[PDB]
Structures are given as C-alpha cells and as structure tokens.
Amino acid sequence: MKTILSNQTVDIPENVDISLKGRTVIVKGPRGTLRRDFNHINVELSLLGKKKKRLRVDKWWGNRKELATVRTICSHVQNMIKGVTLGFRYKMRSVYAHFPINVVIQENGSLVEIRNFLGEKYIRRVRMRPGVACSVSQAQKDELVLEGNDIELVSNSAALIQQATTVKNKDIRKFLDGIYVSEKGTVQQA
C-alpha cells in the first residue's frame, strides 16, 4: 500500500558543512568537495537545525519500490561524508601462480600498465577516472593502492583492473590469477 511517511536522518560531523541547492547535494570539508544530483529519486531533503547538524529525507505516499529508495540516499550521503572526511583507500593484491604480474603506474595515478600476465605479450593500459590515484605501497611485494574521495569512482577503477586481469578460455578454478580487491578501508583512520 501507499505508506504515508518514511524518513531517515543523517547526523553530520562538525568537520563537515553540507548544503544543497534544490535536490543536488554538495559535501565539502578537509579533503575536497563532492557533488551528487538527486533528480532521479524524487524525495524531500530537509536541511534542518542550526549549524546544519543533520539532513532529513522524506518520502510521502510511496509504496514499497519507493520506500526502498529512502535508505539508499542516506547511504550515499554517508559514503560521501566518509570520502570527504577520511577517504577511500582500497588495498588490493596481485595473485599469481607462475608469472609475476608486472604493474606500474603512468601519470601519477592516471594509467596502469599491466604486463606479464599468464605469459601474454599484450599489455593493458587501464585508465582510472580523474580523482582516483593508483600507487604501489611500501613493505609489501604485490600491492595496488587506490586513493580517492568518491567510492563510485574508486571501486569502479578497482573493477576495471579486476576485469582486465582475467583468464580467458581456461579453468579459472585452477588458474587463480589476477588482481583482486583485498581490503576496503579509508585513507586516514578515526
């Protein structure tokens, strides 16, 4: 049936000062600014309270499919606040059996050269979205580190190289090779 009211609040930390024009939200703070346009979701955004301490999202007279769309806005706003405060440092491992996967990074995090995967002479030049920085960390042999603010762009850049390092026309249950996401965390801790 049409549920008369569904709502969920987001308590924002004092380091962040959010605002909104219409239904598009912006989140700024220490690391940078992140925007998201909500023109597909059709809800009410109340930015109430002095010092803008909480964001409320209403849905009036919507059945189950639009009631499912209420918590996802809360989740995207909380992910954006987490990206602005802390960030998204996706650590990921290069698993191989025989051939060492040669990974190097061109243009300070914009492109990844992937070489020597199952003895293939073809190289993969996988380009990240601007905003995501790829790097090789210290004290670890096979490691790729993806830094960024937008969880969409960082995890999409992870999925690009994870689907680039795939084994074709073989048994992937035996050939356990490729670069795979290992740790999903933040840049700085809290």
Q: Is 156 in the site for RNA (CB under 7 A)?
A: yes
Q: Is 84 in the site for RNA (CB under 7 A)?
A: no
Query: How far apart are alpha carbons 27 and 113 in whole angstroms?
Result: 33
* Shorter beta-carbon distance to RNA: residue 141 or 173: 173
- For residue 163, the SS3 value is helix
Which listed range, 60-68, 96-104, 112-120, 132-140, lies at the site for RNA (CB under 7 A)? Answer: 60-68
Query: How far apart are alpha carbons 112 and 59 in whole angstroms?
Result: 43
Distances (CA, A) of 49 to 3, 12, 112: 26, 11, 45
Q: Is 162 in the site for RNA (CB under 7 A)?
A: yes
- The tokens for 11 are 């308590």
Residues 57 and 72 sit within 8 Å (Cβ to Cβ):
no
Interface with RNA (CB under 7 A), residue from 101, 151, 161, 179: 151
Q: Is 159 in the site for RNA (CB under 7 A)?
A: yes
Applying CB under 7 A, the residues found at the interface with RNA are 40-41, 64-65, 67-72, 74-76, 79, 151-152, 155-156, 158-160, 162-163, 184
